Amino acid sequence: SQSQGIQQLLQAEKRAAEKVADARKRKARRLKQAKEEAQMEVEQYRREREQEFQSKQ
Amino acid sequence: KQFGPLVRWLKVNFSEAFIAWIHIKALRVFVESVLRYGLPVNFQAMLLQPNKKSVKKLREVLHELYKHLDSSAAAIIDAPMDIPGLNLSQQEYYPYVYYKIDC
Amino acid sequence: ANFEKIENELKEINTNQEALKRNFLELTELKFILRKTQQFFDEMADPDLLRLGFVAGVINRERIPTFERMLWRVCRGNVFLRQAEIENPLEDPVTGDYVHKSVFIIFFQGDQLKNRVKKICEGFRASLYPCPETPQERKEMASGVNTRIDDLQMVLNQTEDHRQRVLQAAAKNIRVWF
Amino acid sequence: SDADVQKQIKHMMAFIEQEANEKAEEIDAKAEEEFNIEKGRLVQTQRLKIMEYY
Amino acid sequence: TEFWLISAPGEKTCQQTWEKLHAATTKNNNLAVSSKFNIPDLKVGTLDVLVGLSDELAKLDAFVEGVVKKVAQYMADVLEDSKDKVQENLLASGVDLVTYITRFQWDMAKYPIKQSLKNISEIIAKGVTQIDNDLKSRASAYNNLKGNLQNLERKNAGSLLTR
DSSP: OTTTHHHHHHHHHHHHHHHHHHHHHHHHHOOOOHHHHHHHHHHHHHHHHHHHHHHHH | OOHHHHHHHHHHHHHHHHHHHHHHHHHHHHHHHHHHSSSSOOOOOOOEOOTOOOOHHHHHHHHHHHHHHHHSSSSSSSOOOOOSSSSOOOOOOOBBBBEEEEE | OOHHHHHHHHHHHHHHHHHHHHHHHHHHHHEEEEEEHHTTTTOOOOOOOSSSSEEEEEEEOOOHHHHHHHHHHHHHTEEEEEEEEEEEEEEEESSOOOEEEEEEEEESHHHHHHHHHHHHHHHHHHHHOOOSSHHHHHHHHHHHHHHHHHHHHHHHHHHHHHHHHHHHHHHHHHHHHO | OHHHHHHHHHHHHHHHHHHHHHHHHHHHHHHHHHHHHHHHHHHHHHHHHHHHHH | EEEEEEEESSSHHHHHHHIIIIHHHHOOOOEEEEEEEEOOOOOOHHHHHHHHHHHHHHHHHHHHHHHHHHHHHHHHHGGGGGOOHHHHHHOSSSHHHHHHHOHHHHHHHTOOTSOOHHHHHHHHHHHHHHHHHOOOOOOHHHHHHHHHHHHHHHHHSSSSSOO
């Protein structure tokens, strides 16, 4: 009892820590996804203008 | 020419100030109630108009009824001053959230 | 020269004795706090080792009811407190009396409640000291305080013996000096 | 009593969990913002360099 | 009038608490007139800022009470010619302040519910501060005009040399 409450409190604290860690991992993964999507768009445009340069040549 | 203007301005501004005051009363009610009762929220607060010299009986009945809804194992009896610190209790603590409108 | 020595040595002895007694009492209070916090953290400590805020201290017995009421009335239903009597009553850090004491541990949510409880205890003339955050830290600092307590006890005994010896030497001839 | 202990346990448990959820939602919103701004920054810089070159 | 707002923490449902509080109380005796507050569901936040708010709304209730009573005093002064029925003249809406409060309903237009509690508190605070400053300035100007009139009256009064 006097220790059961403390056990419950610590378990809740660990649950909160795990949830915020999961949110942080999601943030990092989405940051990497944003980087990848930007790079893919860059490559698409780069090939577009490469083809345009070839046509001009 | 100015009394009519100033009088009208006071009349309009009294409504706004009173509305804001009641809004702050509501805000304090909700904040204190959510603190006293853990989430989720259930704060169907009751606004009671005291009758003629019925304050003592009404308060006693309310305390008896709220002894269950609130922990009777603390407060109620008495408490010493703790003025030093960031804040000190300013009003009496009752077995519920209690607030006054003094129109 | 003789009397200057016999006075300066005694004054330094008294000052050091007072300061070291204060330190010894504070450290023994810390030791008891650590031991009881370890006892409280023994329901089921499956993990070996941050939102929750933690404090612990000691209160004078029979103030537990008023203190618990004040806590539950200020930090309304949002702070936890556990208490345990300290058998073999101890001597006050400054007030200087043998009084029963209760070692207590308080859990709180955030910074505002931390400040609330800290000020409440300070007004209740308790004492807090730091506390460990992990069992490893608890063991380390408990061993450290225990060793320091034993060292301080040895130094206290030695200095008291020194005071007794010098005062005996003084009394041997104080009348002739006078 | 035991009922008081249980009520407090519920109260702090609920409030700590809700604080965690609020932090998680704030993190998710700021993460979407970071996604958008990083897309904009990287795309703009690489596009500027490619414009210069071409 | 004196009105008491009581939390009545639900009791697992709106009925189980409100019915006993109001209908049962009235049936037992007409000790007090019962009413429902029907507070809107605001956006609850973290407990650190929530306790901060429990202090800020401890201060601001008193401050706004002072401002409203200052407005009442200014009305009683400027309207001293027809000060009768000051409450009726001051009623924010409805017929009287008592009616308004007993039928109080939060104004989402006045305050955005979706906003945070601190944001709503600041929204109220800015308005009340502006109201206090405007009351001070305008009432001071009107009092200065009235004082000029009183000085003219005093000059008319008194002996020929004194006047």
